[PDB]
Amino acid sequence: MDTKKFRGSRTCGGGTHKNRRGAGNRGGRGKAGGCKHHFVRAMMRGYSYGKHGFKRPDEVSRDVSIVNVGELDELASYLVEEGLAEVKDGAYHINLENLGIEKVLGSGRVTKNLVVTSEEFSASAREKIENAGGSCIDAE
Amino acid sequence: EKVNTKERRYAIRSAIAATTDPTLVSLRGHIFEAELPIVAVNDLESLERTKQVIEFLEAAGLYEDVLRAKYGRHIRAGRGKLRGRKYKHKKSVLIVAGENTPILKAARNLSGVDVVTVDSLNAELLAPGTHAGRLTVWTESAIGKLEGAFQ
Amino acid sequence: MGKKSLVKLTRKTNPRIVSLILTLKERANGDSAPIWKDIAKRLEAPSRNYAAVNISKINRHTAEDDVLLIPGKVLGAGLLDHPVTIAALTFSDSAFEKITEAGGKCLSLEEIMEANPKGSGIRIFR
RNA sequence: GGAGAUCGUGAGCUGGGUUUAGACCGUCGUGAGACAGGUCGGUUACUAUCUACUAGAGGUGCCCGAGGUCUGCGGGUAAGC
RNA sequence: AAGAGCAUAAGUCAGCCUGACGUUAUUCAGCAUAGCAGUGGAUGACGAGACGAAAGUCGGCUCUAGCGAACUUUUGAGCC
RNA sequence: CCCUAACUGGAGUCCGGUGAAGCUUACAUUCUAGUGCACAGUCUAGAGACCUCUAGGGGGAAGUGAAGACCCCGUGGAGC
RNA sequence: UGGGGCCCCGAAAAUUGACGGGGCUCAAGUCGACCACCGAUACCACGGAGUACCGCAAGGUAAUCUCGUAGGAAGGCGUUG
RNA sequence: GAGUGUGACAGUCACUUAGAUGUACGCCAAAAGACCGGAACAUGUCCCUGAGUACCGUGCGUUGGAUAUCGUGCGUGAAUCUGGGGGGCACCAACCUCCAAAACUAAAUACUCCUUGAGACCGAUAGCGAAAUAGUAGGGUGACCGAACGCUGAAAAGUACCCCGAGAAGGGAGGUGCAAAGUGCCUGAAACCUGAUAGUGAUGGAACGAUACGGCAUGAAAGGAUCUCUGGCAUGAAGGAAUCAUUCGCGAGGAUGUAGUACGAAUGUCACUGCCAGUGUCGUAUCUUACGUUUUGAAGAACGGGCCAGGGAGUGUAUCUUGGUGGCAAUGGCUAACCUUUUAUCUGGGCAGCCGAAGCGAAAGCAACAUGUGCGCAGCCUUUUGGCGAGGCACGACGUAU
RNA sequence: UUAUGCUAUCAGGUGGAUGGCUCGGCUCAAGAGCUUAUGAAGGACGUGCCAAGCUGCGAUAAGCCCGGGGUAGGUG
Ligand SMILES: [Mg+2]
Ligand SMILES: [Mg+2]
Ligand SMILES: [Mg+2]
Ligand SMILES: [Mg+2]
Ligand SMILES: [Mg+2]
Ligand SMILES: [Mg+2]
Ligand SMILES: [Mg+2]
Ligand SMILES: [Mg+2]
Ligand SMILES: [Mg+2]
Fold this sequence. Notes:
part of a larger assembly, 3 chains, B: 151 residues, alpha/beta, two-stranded antiparallel ribbon, 36% helix, C: alpha/beta, 5-stranded parallel β-sheet, binds magnesium ion, RNA-binding, RNA binding (chain C), Ribosomal_eL18/eL18-A/B/_CS (chain C), ribosomal protein (chain C)
């Protein structure tokens, strides 16, 4: 802390000099006393007792990476500029297998004909893609 | 400490822009009559004796700051002398050649004068002690190797 | 300018920001316009809450040929489909390229003050 | 006669009792051990700085210089009961 | 227990019944002001009923006490 | 012991030499009463007090020795 | 006979001592009123300092700012490098 | 032009320094040769391919290892290519993957007795305990514990000669030295002690001081010279008389007028004067029972300090959170190890990874608003009352769990 | 002529702080990395003209011999 500010104040912003002694001026060490005298602090900070649920193995569980149809529609031209997609017959042919995204969600609007191929599309993503004239193809 | 590379490069570019400014360069104790920025033709790289460096600095109007560095170089006070820091030095002239040439050995012995290639142009050379306005001498080669130096 | 404004001004370390605040309160003095005093008070705020406007809000809440002053940086998350002039503190490169391809103009607070110190039609954003 | 003076008085004394460590008796407790129960035994440290008092001196103060003889502001007494 | 409530009754008797129902949201008060556990206790909602001509009443016994975290085990329905 | 006396040797007293230690925030010539954390040389109001030195024994400095060993407390120990 | 004011007896404590002391009697005590004066850093005034907020700045306002422990915040002095 | 020494600040006086050289024994070492040989093909009722081992039961330790770590105590214990093991409880099947129980193996890595370099390090009570006659003096039977002591001067030029003294002590006189700095000798503080000067002092009351006024001594420098002392005149805020007259009041006194007069802090100006500010001590008047701490409460007969000097207490790593200032900013931000070092800097790289970008749910799994609406501050416009209105507030709609 | 004393200053003594210097220490980095029965490290004792400690050396005892460097003084 500011050492030079408290040169002269004796207690150094600590009240009694009987304060600031050891673990007894904090109520134990670590996040201790969470069932007896730090119950409310345990509730406030998330230390509250209990176990809930289970975990599947990480080798089988997988967290897919997603992107919304609004993001694809409103920067598909940036995809064609970057080289990750091209334009055939006025329909922006965009593949999800190389952009790293594996699921498509229909958050937002679709305007241009996007021929989107990906691992799995949401139902509303399929709806918004097919309303605009594009198509969805599941890619192995 | 740590500075991100983008903001460190922005700091170095800010320092490089300060070398052109006459008010800050003359506001750092640098004594000279040249008109900033002092860019030189690339013959400066290949002169191999400090007398030629002296003649160039005299011709450019920069030898006064070299003399100030040499004759103001003064003993510091305290425990610095015992630990190896006897004199307290001055910064006068900074030469930036395009590549490793014998001007690096030439003006290496100029009093308070640092010479470095454009690659080794840290911000300390461009502004020692947090103050920008070093009296820097560039060449055409440093100018041509500087279009994307820090962007 | 009181002692609190002096504290907030001296706390800033950007010479451009302090010069902008001084010139803005001078302009609000001379032109009797609270637009420049308002931008000065916004710039004198904490720099952790400075404006950072994306292209989306400017596209959504504007019209053709609108004057925008954004005390902060203009970011580039979104699309612009009409010419808007944006006088802002700083520009992202993507936002600058977006406005340039959209036909808009991207100048600074000093340039917009010189263009028209009255500030008429200057809808401030955040 | 009674009572007060740190139940006056241990840098005055004594150490008999209570209030250490040992042991015995009785009573409690499974026990270690305990008893506002008893019994036997059981270390009293200090060169007085200041103050107070008791006596003995040296100075100055008062003052022609010195000596002698007195007075009595006061203090004390139980000088007897 | 104590205090409060109640008379064409919140009492007594008789007819028919099982609302002593599954699920779920708020706000109170334990904990005024003003954080604080599982719990209650008042309003509601979804689905089912009971009694009643209907309005209504019924989320036990007129209201306020009769009870207990995490972990663990057992059990109920269907799922991961 | 009533009830103390005299005497002897060593200390002490005085002198020459040698020569430490322990208490100590400061001042300090005190006495009474009150007040003040309810036990004051220093406060308040009075009364006394010229200063210095020597000897005396210990009234006071809640005299000095010493983070109470009795009692309590410590989510402190040890032995049994 | 009743209701009142002041005073008296009831009324004895331990180092000599406390209306603060001297002392005071149509008061220097008590009661009902009154006059004039004394007496603070309060109040008023003058000059000055600091602070709070506002003003671009000069500067403006403050009867409605100035005490301060635990503590928070801000600005400075000093040593060595 | 890194420094160090040199009778004081040294690029040019010396050692040096950048740079060139020499170098025996050893260390590495490529060309040029000799030495053994290696790799496939087809072949099949053929042969070999690690045992108290793999594995299993039970106990214990250990581990994050959970019915799913490794170890090993006891017991058991195989198969041989048509074979055996693994794929986080076991068994069956598919699929994938490997060959144990025998053995060797540089480099990248770790440490510092030692060598060299460097330092926002310490500067002698610090830094090693030791600026080393230091693990020494000293302490302990022993395991072991453990200091203090640095500085003459440029050059000894380290005091000749004489006197006192018993004196190779010491003192005076005298000299060397710019200077005694005169042998643990550079500067040389305070405590403590001795002497002198000033004030006071044997009639005197104590937190030792603060404020005002005087006596005595000082007041050279650094402080004043319209400054110090003493008066007149002008303007004078707040306040405001004395005396006299009238009238009231039992009286002390009040009211009215004189009079808001004369005066009055201070601000200017003119004479007048040479001291004043200050310092030391003493006296007089008023006020204060010290400091820190524990305390509801301290001068406490509560605790700490005899005095003086020096030393002596919010520091680092990792991690989480938030402020001030900045960089970059959904086409996001940062890079970590590491490479580049021309010796720790630095420049250019380093997309692994972390956070943000989509949440809800234990899990499978599913997956949203690029504003549909109302109000409205700053701000802009405006018949100055309204309009538009970023951010803000309140709904509506939607994702998912129950 | 007031002693014992009190306070302030000054001179001197005792003392060794402050200041200045420093061949030591600490920390970090870079190299190099074993030795010993062919008798080590460590220790005891001896060892100098006058030499007590430390250091070096071992009855050849602060030393002996040989090749290289250096060259005018040496005798820790
Ligand atoms: Mg507390
Ligand atoms: Mg006694
Ligand atoms: Mg105690
Ligand atoms: Mg407790
Ligand atoms: Mg405070
Ligand atoms: Mg050199
Ligand atoms: Mg040391
Ligand atoms: Mg307190
Ligand atoms: Mg100190």
